[PDB]
Design a protein around this nucleic acid. Sequence first.
RNA 1: ACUGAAACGAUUGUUGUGCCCCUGGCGGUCGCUUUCAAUGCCU
Length: 84
Amino acid sequence: TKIYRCKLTLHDNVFFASREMGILYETEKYFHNWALSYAFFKGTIIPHPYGLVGQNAQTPAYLDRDREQNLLHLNDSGIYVFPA
RNA sequence: ACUGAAACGAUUGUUGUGCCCCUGGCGGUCGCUUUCAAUGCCU
């Protein structure tokens, strides 16, 4: 039902290691949706565990309902950010 | 796990060595301490 137009302005330089080519790592010109969803709603809705250990330190949990940091919590709150 | 977690382009480095504000030069030239004068007066 409700829709929000968000303009994002960079207040310091943004880096993501989106592709990697020798000594240089580079940031794609689109902010991915799942990155923005956790940037908006981690701590407020999705849990924000300071520490990770074991396989959970190297394996993502985007759509795992057992793990805490899931974007599926947002499905439930009925929110969806599109990419940028 | 935000294409995630941590993330010092860092360490050492003398704008440095040599160098005369130097060489030449007359405070010079002209100039009368001048002018006037009873060792006087009376014995």
